[PDB]
Amino acid sequence: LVVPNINSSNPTTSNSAPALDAAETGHTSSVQPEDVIETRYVQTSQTRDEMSLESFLGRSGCIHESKLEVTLANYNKENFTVWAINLQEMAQIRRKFELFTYTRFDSEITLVPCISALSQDIGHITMQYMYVPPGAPVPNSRDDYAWQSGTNASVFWQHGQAYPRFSLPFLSVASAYYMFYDGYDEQDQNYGTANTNNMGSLCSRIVTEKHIHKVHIMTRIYHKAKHVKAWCPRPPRALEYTRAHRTNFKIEDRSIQTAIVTRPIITTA
Amino acid sequence: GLPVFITPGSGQFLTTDDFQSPCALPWYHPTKEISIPGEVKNLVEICQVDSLVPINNTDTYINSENMYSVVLQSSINAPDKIFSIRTDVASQPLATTLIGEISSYFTHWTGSLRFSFMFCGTANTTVKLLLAYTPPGIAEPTTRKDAMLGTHVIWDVGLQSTISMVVPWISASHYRNTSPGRSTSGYITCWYQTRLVIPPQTPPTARLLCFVSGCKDFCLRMARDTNLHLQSGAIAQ
Amino acid sequence: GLPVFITPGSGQFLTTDDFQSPCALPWYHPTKEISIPGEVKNLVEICQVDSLVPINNTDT
């Protein structure tokens, strides 16, 4: 994708003022360097590929850090985690996608599981990550029958194994994901994207049977968009995020602080 | 089987990689695409849209709509400086504009910037202003004479309320860093060329709006995370 | 998948190897090349330039 060349320009004395316009119209000016100055002929050679959406959004970033603290006391009763999937909990990723009103893409998920040794050894640890779409039974314990995964997709990782990874196709029941939603429940509740963005949960359990080593397992989840499309650009988020699915920005006993830096006097740059 | 040789790098997770991976929902057929107006394909499309520069970024006007306008005065009968700003796309106050925000997701930039001004006084109020761009290598101008020695436009505010001026790319290197250190691309300064004149019974001051966007010229490279946004804590579910 | 057989040497880092590796900055477009006089392509070009021999290498 090529940037146009800067053409040669000469001294003009004319009735048409390309520099003069009306921005009241809501249209951006069309003035190029050649219209305002006696320009030199330069052969520009820049591709714009890296500025494409595929390039911009097609990078893996963290969207969730799942901590499983293995308890040896009630081994089968606990030792599992549940997380309602979404891209609203980590700022770097969230801000990039919210530059658009609607987005559509396939997802690549890469998992980075880290075992923290709290005993002399870690033994042999194996984890199971299961995707539970809305409506499927959510596991209630480490030994829940739902872990049989008769039809849900599960992925297994054992100590020593490379980072797991798999793709998910565009999941919505609509034609695009809603990055913003000016609407409600059928009950006039839950303003926002909580209504529209119900992708189910990601559940995990330590598969290895009762053992004697305390460990904590932190699995960070990375998401990368593939084959991306987006519509209706929006201004970038100017303040810290406080909640998922809400554009709220007020923090208790703290003033609104944007990234604009003030200066003493506007006649000094 | 086929004798193979494992290469360094194998098994690593590089967040900017590009490999295929098995699909967890085989045979799944996604919702058909429907027509939605407003598709964006490249970030440069956003960089090319004008947005207001918070030119009046002082503690007095800071969290309001006033940081976006400058007040001109009819009582001034002199070649005074009205305002100035560095030309670096991601420097303050340009940093939070659309183009400054997108530029902050990249490391290098190149191209020309289009600055537009809209005069918002009465239809009977007039003025001529000197808008000047000072190439780098020198201190920002403190007198109209020094400013006009550079690239400039003399704006006659009459029936058209807007004007566009282009800050051309004048740099040693083909690209510049979006985070400049002890560096500058220059300055834009505004001066009274004549005077703000008004008939009787007309407000004695008038505001000016300043917009910025990039030209066909404009280009950014080397994607990076922005310094214009933070996360100091968890985001509640 | 395709049955493969791992060969000795696999996984090692040999500093004089010559393999491809993924690029960390995908899609990045480097600065165009401009003409700079004085290009060198081979070290022999330097070996063929006269230089002074410090023939009088005594402590004095």
């Binding site: 994708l1 591709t47 590929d49 494409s52 595929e54 390039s55 097609g58 396939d106 997802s107 793709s167 998910l168 196709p169 565009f170 593939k226 084959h227 991306v228 | 590009d18 490999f19 295929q20 991976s21 098995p22 699909c23 929902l25 085989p26 045979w27 799944y28 | 995908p26 899609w27 477009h29």
Partner: peptide
């Protein structure tokens, strides 16, 4: 198939399109 680059080899190995790598611009 083979593609040029800003020449290299590339084919899809999985049966679902979501599995494919980044899109060509």
């Amino acid at each position: 198939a083979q593609v040029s680059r800003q020449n290299y080899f590339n084919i899809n190995y999985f049966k679902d399109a979501a599995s494919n790598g980044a899109s060509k611009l």
